Amino acid sequence: VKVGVNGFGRIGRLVTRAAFNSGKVDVVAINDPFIDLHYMVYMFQYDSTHGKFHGTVKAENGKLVINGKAITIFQERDPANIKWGDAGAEYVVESTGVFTTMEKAGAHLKGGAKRVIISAPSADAPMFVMGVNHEKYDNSLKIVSNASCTTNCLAPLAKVIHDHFGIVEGLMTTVHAITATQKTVDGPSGKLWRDGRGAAQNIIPASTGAAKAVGKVIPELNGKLTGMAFRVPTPNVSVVDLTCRLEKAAKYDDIKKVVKQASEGPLKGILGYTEDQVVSCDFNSDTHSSTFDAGAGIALNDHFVKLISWYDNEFGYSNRVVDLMVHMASKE
Amino acid sequence: VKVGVNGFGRIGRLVTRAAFNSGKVDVVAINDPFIDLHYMVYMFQYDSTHGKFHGTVKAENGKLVINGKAITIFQERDPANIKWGDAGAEYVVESTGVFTTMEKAGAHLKGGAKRVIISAPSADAPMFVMGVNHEKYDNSLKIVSNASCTTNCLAPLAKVIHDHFGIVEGLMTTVHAITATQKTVDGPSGKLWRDGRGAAQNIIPASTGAAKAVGKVIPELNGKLTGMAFRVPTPNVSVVDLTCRLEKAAKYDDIKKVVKQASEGPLKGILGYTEDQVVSCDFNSDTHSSTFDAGAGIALNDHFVKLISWYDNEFGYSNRVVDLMVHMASKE
Amino acid sequence: VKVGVNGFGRIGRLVTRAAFNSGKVDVVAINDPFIDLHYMVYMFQYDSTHGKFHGTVKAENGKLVINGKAITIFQERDPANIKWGDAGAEYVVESTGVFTTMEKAGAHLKGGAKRVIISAPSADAPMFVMGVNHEKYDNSLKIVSNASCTTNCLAPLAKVIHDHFGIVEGLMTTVHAITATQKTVDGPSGKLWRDGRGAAQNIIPASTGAAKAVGKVIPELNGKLTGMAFRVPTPNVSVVDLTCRLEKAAKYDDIKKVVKQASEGPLKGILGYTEDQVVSCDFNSDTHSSTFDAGAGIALNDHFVKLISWYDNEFGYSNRVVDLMVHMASKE
Amino acid sequence: VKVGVNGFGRIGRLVTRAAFNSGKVDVVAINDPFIDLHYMVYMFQYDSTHGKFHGTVKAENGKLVINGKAITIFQERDPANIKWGDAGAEYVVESTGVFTTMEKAGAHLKGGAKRVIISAPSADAPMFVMGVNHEKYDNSLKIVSNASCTTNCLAPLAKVIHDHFGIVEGLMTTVHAITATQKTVDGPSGKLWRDGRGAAQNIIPASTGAAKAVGKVIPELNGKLTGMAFRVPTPNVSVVDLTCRLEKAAKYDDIKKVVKQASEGPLKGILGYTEDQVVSCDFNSDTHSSTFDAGAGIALNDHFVKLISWYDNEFGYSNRVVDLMVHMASKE
Ligand SMILES: NC(=O)c1ccc[n+]([C@@H]2O[C@H](COP(=O)([O-])OP(=O)(O)OC[C@H]3O[C@@H](n4cnc5c(N)ncnc54)[C@H](O)[C@@H]3O)[C@@H](O)[C@H]2O)c1
Ligand SMILES: NC(=O)c1ccc[n+]([C@@H]2O[C@H](COP(=O)([O-])OP(=O)(O)OC[C@H]3O[C@@H](n4cnc5c(N)ncnc54)[C@H](O)[C@@H]3O)[C@@H](O)[C@H]2O)c1
């Protein structure tokens, strides 16, 4: 599939990188009114957390040339004015974080785009999580959402645990690496006061609808999950801490077994499994949506257990956006 | 009561700092075979996380003089060889971390010390948590433990929640600040492989018996609590994340009501309460053992909730060591 | 003197904090379109790096009440609209960082303000550095600049070294703490690309005109100094690294003696002096503009030396803004 | 050439990694009487700063098998006892940081090894810096030193600048990333009080003989260089800040010209050159010994300049240890 990407931020750049490192889709256009061609070369080439881009990045003839492939560049604030159709872009990845509504994201279709994938939760667009409910997608859906990075980490795990033991209720906490929405020093945040406090100095409590969203991709869990988060001073990689009450008795060993089996089969590449003495950095640039940490979790009894799963909030999610588009194309 | 302190590390120094700013407890002797008199002046005077000491510190005639009070300095590696008696130390704070058992801490009694307070969990010494079970102490106890910093944060909260609603079962996680036990860069730790990884770069999973210990200071909770921890790159101040099942239905507001009332009454100074948009640094040098964060927590339903409480793992605990000694002296 | 402050950011808030601590000036008005009254209470009360404000802060009948004194709050986006005169503000501290020109800062005059102090370098407004050239100010100056935090650290030191030994030429490097202008993760920064890279992960080279500016407050040094900077992942406190060649031979002990005498006399409170084994945190909330670190520096020979001086980039500078206004008032 | 490595710390592991990542040499033995075979697999496989090993690491029959190549493991505490001879270890990399002297390091020769390379400065062993004085090595030298990481960064640059313009005198400052020698929180380090202070919280001044050592690999510069360092909270990658006086007038562009040609010719792979807007992370895992940052430096005049050069203190140096051995082998 030929793809267009709106917004060249962390998500836009990593989705583009994933498209190229994996070769699964072909990026032929990028739109960003604030980042010009030459700056794009720089931002895509050098990455503090994921390293310098493996391949080539040059600006040739007004176009961004990555690994030899020329990419048309646009500078439109209003997506409706982006000529995706002329660039040959069939699918458009909406990653600005500003057009997450069915209506706003629809603006891309007015330029030639056949379909739009919102790289963020949507209030009305149907949300999908690879490995959990992506087969519920059909050709009538012109605008879809790939949910959030945290939802993509919890949903795969929640599905396995619920199918095998039945989740009566659960509460999650995600210890999250600092994000771009945060501030370097105590600054104005207006909406969320705690988010304005110095990121590198604090452990910051924050709200998140990721746990509740899992009830949307896994209907049986609707109303049985919710949680919150703590933003901590690490550049990348976060972890889900799921405390849940199980319906059927489950020894910790059986939980490991069931998850391991899932990571080697139906959820391979999506849900990972490890028993090694890992730490956050061991998952930097890891493409999994969620990686179960056997040794980190702990059970109180056969019905009350705390499960731990890692996720490169940047890389994993970006790869799922590409995997979602591949699945969609196979349904055309 | 005249006090002696063994080990001049973070706790030894902060307990001494807490003592001098307090009043009724006097430090008259300090032992540390690794830190010489002049180095002690430096380490006690300058503190990266708590600021320069407010008062005077000097090296005079071989003694450490703080705020004018001369302190006898010892350099024994064997606690059995410390002459606490000659120096006048009735109570000895055992804070090295390598003499936590009854059999080892008793050594201080050879030099004349009358009672020994272990500033850490003990495998056999009776453990106490101010505000929770300190009333259980009696004059026959010559060696006691003040438990851990994390246990001192969870116990006060657990007591209030259990007294009013009944904790059926709970699982905690403590997002914990960096400790002197970790390494600056990936280094050796043959016992706990994960703790050897770069502290500033990672979110590090770790085991902790703090939750299980609460079942020791609150017998009714024995076997109903356990948890683990995540070490993150912040210099000080940690937070307890308690997910528990309640027996009696409890609206979040009722929980707020009850906790707040406890902090203004029986647990004043021990358990704090706030509804402000706080972050970890707001508890820097806070002397509370635990401070309930009303806005950070969240409930799934009237019987399943996640409670959040802050604690300056260094300052709070150090002040409780002093408070424990004051209580003991009042029972002599 | 009745003072008004525009912009309630790190400096606006710290200048206000500095003002209340010592009744040198009375803040009677504040303006900031991005921070409403209630948010101001929060931002001023809680400070990650300098601690909770010691005193009281509340929102009463539409005014910000600090330590009892009620403060008129304005929310004008345009400086000209701000009715400084009405509220009773003689001097106005221009700390937004956007109106640093003579032309722009003059707008405060159109509102009733008598004098205007720009808390940042100015392209045309006369710049002053307490202890170095503040004696050059006169009643005809309605708009002045207090230079930069780095210039205030280097100038005092440069003056003493030049007065006694003569600086033939010098090059400085300032290892700087992070500022509100940096990003938490690799993000866009059109004018300064390096400044867009993750602040907590990198040592970031940056340009600075602070060294060249010293030639402006000390005319004899015009064209004899320049330098650059390295932004590093520390919340606050920076250090100047001055490498200079001397005209008159100077043993290192002579440099120490000369700096020590200056800090105890004419530059007391401005230029500090220490021989202790200090690190950056030992200067947190230190009100000096520059503190000479005797043990940190090193000389190659009697004419080529490297001098080290610390400065709390936030606190020191904020106090100098207040000291500058006090001096101005004494000249009215 | 077959190699043995004594010490499996940061240096030992990265030298081993470099050996396989290049294939210039072949590691056949590792001696570390403090790290168990299974722990070695873990420490070599997972690396916080350089990522998971891009290969294979098992533990087949008492040996460490990397990329399908078996390595004999030793737990000998006295180098003399190691059987380098039987294993086929022609050269031994002494990287413990303990056996640095000509005699302590000599302990390896008895074990059957032909030559010993000390991965650290030596008080009496001849020191070499690839690209600067490695041609001075001859077959009579059984024990050699590869100097320090900082010396390997400054020497290449100093050689080029001195060769073309003549360095009259210079003073350097190295802004250094966090090292193992440091402590996570204020701890004991009696020799150097400042090195014991919390690494993640401070900018720590430290002494370094790297600048003076350049006078030993470049004799003409003996006594013309010295400097110091600042430890900052970054995991890896450091930068040299060289302020020097030139004999021959040199415009900044002439310096760029000369350094660039040197990086494309005689010093290719050793001295790098860039004009891009780089930051520390852009040099993570960079194998150069030193990379000139054109845009970061600044000149006061044609005879006084500040030159900036980056170096991955871990990776660059480790690769030079391998390059030194390759050169030695070619002289056999
Ligand atoms: N700081 C915290 O977060 C905290 C709070 C709860 C409990 N604790 C407990 O406090 C104890 C120490 O922690 P800390 O942070 O002060 O550690 P440090 O900061 O490790 O302090 C320990 C001190 O013990 C001294 N020491 C070592 N061996 C000795 C010996 N043989 N004789 C005499 N002195 C000796 C050291 O020189 C050092 O100054 C541990 O048992 C720990 O579990 C720590
Ligand atoms: N913190 C330092 O290191 C430091 C010390 C020396 C000088 N300075 C100078 O101080 C100034 C501000 O720096 P800071 O760190 O406090 O920044 P912030 O921390 O960016 O503070 C600026 C404040 O200005 C307000 N503001 C923005 N637009 C405005 C408008 N149109 N009208 C009124 N208020 C507006 C913001 O809401 C914000 O609170 C800059 O010019 C900077 O160069 C900084």
Query: Could you count the other beta carbons within 10 Å of the beta carbon of residue B112?
Result: 17
Alpha carbons A237 and A234: distance in angstroms, whole number:
8
B186·D35 Cβ contact <8 A: no
B42·C278 Cβ contact <8 A: no
Query: Could you count the other beta carbons within 10 Å of the beta carbon of residue A247?
Result: 12
Residues 281-310, chain D: which have Cβ within 8 Å of C? 281, 293, 295-298, 300-301, 304-306, 308
The answer to whether C244 touches C162, Cβ cutoff 8 Å, is: no
What is the residue-wise DSSP string for A105-156?
HHGGGGGT-SEEEESS--SSSPB--TTTTGGG--TT-SEEE---HHHHHHHH
Q: Give strand pairing partners of D271.
A: D290
Residue range(s) of every CATH 3.40.50.720 domain in chain B: 1-146+314-332
Query: What distances in angstroms separate CA B148 from CA B130, B199, B211, one per listed residue?
Result: 12, 21, 10
In this structure, what token pair is assigned to residue A172?
């999650």
Alpha carbons B190 and A187: distance in angstroms, whole number:
43
The answer to whether D109 touches D125, Cβ cutoff 8 Å, is: no
The answer to whether B168 touches B246, Cβ cutoff 8 Å, is: yes
Relative to beta strand A238-246, strand A304-311 is antiparallel
Alpha carbons A154 and B205: distance in angstroms, whole number:
18
Alpha carbons B152 and D301: distance in angstroms, whole number:
62
Q: Give strand pairing partners of C3.
A: C27, C91
Helical packing angle, D149-165 and D252-264, nearest 10°:
120
Query: What distances in angstroms separate CA D248 from CA C256, D164, D273, one per listed residue?
Result: 33, 8, 22
Alpha carbons D1 and D25: distance in angstroms, whole number:
5
Contact partners for chain D, using 3 or more CB pairs closer than 8 A, are A, B, C
Coil/strand/helix, residue C203:
coil
Q: Give strand pairing partners of B171.
A: B226, B243
Rounded to the nearest whole angstrom, what is the distance from the C-alpha of residue C268 to the centroid of ligand 2? 28
Contacting residues of A for C198, CB less than 8 Å apart: 48-49, 235
Handedness of CA A12, A13, A18, A19 (dihedral sign): positive
Residue range(s) of every CATH 3.30.360.10 domain in chain D: 147-313
Alpha carbons C265 and C168: distance in angstroms, whole number:
25
- The residue whose two tokens read 């501290």 is C93
Query: Could you count the other beta carbons within 10 Å of the beta carbon of residue B113?
Result: 30
- The residue whose two tokens read 């010691």 is C54
Question: Nearest CB to A279: which of D48, D51, D276?
Answer: D48
Alpha carbons C329 and C318: distance in angstroms, whole number:
17
Alpha carbons D1 and D117: distance in angstroms, whole number:
14
Using CA atoms of D175, D180, D184, D185 in order, give the dihedral in degrees to the nearest 10.
-80
Helix, strand, coil shares, percent, chain C, to 5 = 30, 25, 40
In this structure, what token pair is assigned to residue A126?
């149907």
CB-based burial label for A60 (10 Å; 0-12, 13-18, 19+): exposed
Q: Which amino acid is at A104?
A: K
Alpha carbons B303 and B247: distance in angstroms, whole number:
7
Alpha carbons D53 and D285: distance in angstroms, whole number:
12
Q: Which method, experimentally, gave rise to this model?
A: X-ray
Q: Give strand pairing partners of A81.
A: none
Alpha carbons D213 and D221: distance in angstroms, whole number:
10
The answer to whether C49 touches C235, Cβ cutoff 8 Å, is: yes
Say yes or no: CB of residue B209 within 6 Å of ligand 1.
no
Rounded to the nearest whole angstrom, what is the distance from the C-alpha of residue B104 to the centroid of ligand 1? 15
Q: Supply φ then ψ for residue D265, to 5 degrees.
A: -120, -110
- The residue whose two tokens read 């100038």 is C155
Alpha carbons A150 and A145: distance in angstroms, whole number:
14
Q: Supply φ then ψ for residue D156, to 5 degrees.
A: -60, -45
Contacting residues of B for C59, CB less than 8 Å apart: none
Instruction: Give Cα B309 to chain centroid, integer Å.
Output: 15
Q: After which residues does chain B show a gap where C to N exceeds 2.5 Å?
A: none
Establish whether C149 is an annotated binding residue.
yes
Coil/strand/helix, residue C119:
coil
Query: What distances in angstroms separate CA B112 from CA B3, B31, B85, B142, C13, one per listed residue?
Result: 12, 14, 4, 12, 54
Coil/strand/helix, residue D171:
strand
Rounded to the nearest whole angstrom, what is the distance from the C-alpha of residue D192 to the centroid of ligand 1? 20
Q: Which of C31, C32, C92 to mutate to test the pocket of ligand 2 (most atoms within 8 A of CB)?
A: C32
Say yes or no: CB of residue B34 within 6 Å of ligand 1.
yes
What is the 3 state secondary structure string of A299-331? EEECCEEEEEEEECCCHHHHHHHHHHHHHHHHH
Identify from B279, B281, B282 which residue to disrupt to test chain A contact, counting A C-beta atoms within 10 A and taking the largest count: B279
Relative to beta strand B238-246, strand B204-207 is unpaired
Say yes or no: CB of residue C8 within 6 Å of ligand 2.
yes
C284·B51 Cβ contact <8 A: yes
What is the residue-wise DSSP string for B8-58?
-SHHHHHHHHHHHHHSS-EEEEEE-TTS-HHHHHHHHH--TTT-S-SS-EE
Alpha carbons A288 and C285: distance in angstroms, whole number:
45
Q: Supply φ then ψ for residue B326, to 5 degrees.
A: -65, -45
Find the catalytic residue in D149, D153, D244, D281. D149
Rounded to the nearest whole angstrom, what is the distance from the C-alpha of residue C10 to the centroid of ligand 2? 6
Where in the sequence numbering do the catalytic residues of C fall?
A: 149
What letters, b where the CB count within 10 A reaches 16 and e where it falls short, cover C97-136? eebbebebbbbbbebbbbbbbbbbbbeebbbbbbbbbbee
Residues 6 or more apart in contact with residue D216 via CB below 8 angstroms: D127, D222
Q: Please give the radius of gyration of chain D, using alpha carbons only, rounded to the nearest integer.
A: 20
Q: Does domain D147-313 have CATH number 3.30.70.100?
A: no
Alpha carbons A308 and A242: distance in angstroms, whole number:
6
- Give the CB-side neighbour count of residue B100, counting CA atoms within 13 A: 11
CATH number for the region D1-146+314-332 comes to 3.40.50.720
Query: What distances in angstroms separate CA A312 from CA A235, C1, C184, one per listed residue?
Result: 10, 55, 17
Say yes or no: CB of residue C148 within 6 Å of ligand 2.
yes
Residues 259-278, chain D: which have Cβ within 8 Å of A? 276-278
Instruction: Report the atom number in ligand 1 closest to the C-alpha of B179.
Output: 3
The answer to whether A296 touches A275, Cβ cutoff 8 Å, is: no
- The residue whose two tokens read 């168990």 is D36
Q: Give strand pairing partners of A307.
A: A242
Query: Could you count the other beta carbons within 10 Å of the beta carbon of residue D90?
Result: 22
Q: Give strand pairing partners of D240.
A: D174, D309
Alpha carbons B274 and A126: distance in angstroms, whole number:
39
Closest C-alpha among A123, A211, A135 to residue A172: A211
Q: Return the DSSP state at C215.
A: H
Q: What is the longest distance spanned by two Cα atoms in chain C?
A: 65
In this structure, what token pair is assigned to residue B313?
């793992």
Say yes or no: CB of residue A223 within 6 Å of ligand 2.
no
Q: Return the DSSP state at D244.
A: E
Helical packing angle, A210-217 and A149-165, nearest 10°:
60
In this structure, what token pair is assigned to residue D247?
């004999």
Q: Supply φ then ψ for residue B3, to 5 degrees.
A: -115, 145
In this structure, what token pair is assigned to residue B218?
């609150």
What is the residue-wise DSSP string for A194-242?
GGGSBTTT--EEEE--HHHHHHHHSGGGTTSEEEEEEEES-SS-EEEEE
Alpha carbons B121 and B151: distance in angstroms, whole number:
9
Closest C-alpha among A23, A122, A113, A109 to residue A66: A23
Q: Measured in Å, how far apart are chain C's first and last C-alpha atoms?
A: 11
Which ranges of C26-132 does DSSP label H, i.e. alpha helix?
A: 37-45, 84-87, 102-105
- Give the CB-side neighbour count of residue B144, counting CA atoms within 13 A: 24
The answer to whether C260 touches C273, Cβ cutoff 8 Å, is: yes
Contacting residues of D for A276, CB less than 8 Å apart: 42, 46
The helix or strand, by DSSP H or E, that contains position D211, with its residue range, turns out to be helix D210-217
Establish whether D77 is an annotated binding residue.
yes
Q: Which amino acid is at A93?
A: V
Alpha carbons B321 and C2: distance in angstroms, whole number:
48
Nearest Cα of chain A lies from the Cα of D111 at a distance, in angstroms, of 35
In this structure, what token pair is assigned to residue B185?
């860069």
What letters, b where the CB count within 10 A reaches 16 and e where it falls short, cover A176-185? bbbbebbbbb
The answer to whether A198 touches C48, Cβ cutoff 8 Å, is: yes
Query: Could you count the other beta carbons within 10 Å of the beta carbon of residue B268?
Result: 12
Say yes or no: CB of residue C209 within 6 Å of ligand 2.
no
Alpha carbons B109 and C238: distance in angstroms, whole number:
49
Closest C-alpha among C185, C190, C225, C188 to residue C208: C225
What letters, b where the CB count within 10 A reaches 16 and e where it falls short, cover B16-35? bbbbbeeeebbbbbbbbeeb
Strands (E), chain B: 2-6, 26-31, 57-60, 63-66, 69-74, 91-94, 115-118, 143-145, 167-176, 204-207, 225-231, 238-246, 271-274, 290-293, 298-301, 304-311
The resolution of the experimental structure, rounded to one decimal in Å, is 2.4
Alpha carbons C144 and C89: distance in angstroms, whole number:
16
Rounded to the nearest whole angstrom, what is the distance from the C-alpha of residue A285 to the centroid of ligand 1? 37
Alpha carbons A71 and B120: distance in angstroms, whole number:
62
Q: Supply φ then ψ for residue C304, to 5 degrees.
A: -135, 110
Residues 6 or more apart in contact with residue A306 via CB below 8 angstroms: A241, A242, A243, A297, A298, A299, A300, B171, B173, B227, B228, B243
Query: What distances in angstroms separate CA D294 from CA C121, C161, C195, D55, D267, one per listed residue?
Result: 27, 30, 17, 36, 17
Confirm or reject contact between B47 and chain D (CB < 8 A).
yes
Chain A: residue whose CA lies nearest to B278: A194
Identify from B40, B282, B283 which residue to disrupt to test chain C contact, counting C C-beta atoms within 10 A and taking the largest count: B282
Alpha carbons B75 and A223: distance in angstroms, whole number:
61
Considering every ligand atom shown, identify the ligand nearest to the alpha carbon of residue B107 and give its number: 1
In this structure, what token pair is assigned to residue A204?
């910051």
- The residue whose two tokens read 């803040």 is C27
Say yes or no: CB of residue C297 within 6 Å of ligand 2.
no
What is the residue-wise DSSP string for B279-300?
-GGGGTT---SEEEETTT-EEE
What letters, b where the CB count within 10 A reaches 16 and e where it falls short, cover C218-251? beebeebbbbbbbbbbbbbbbbbbbbbbbeeebe
Q: Supply φ then ψ for residue C260, to 5 degrees.
A: -55, -45
- The residue whose two tokens read 């008895």 is D110
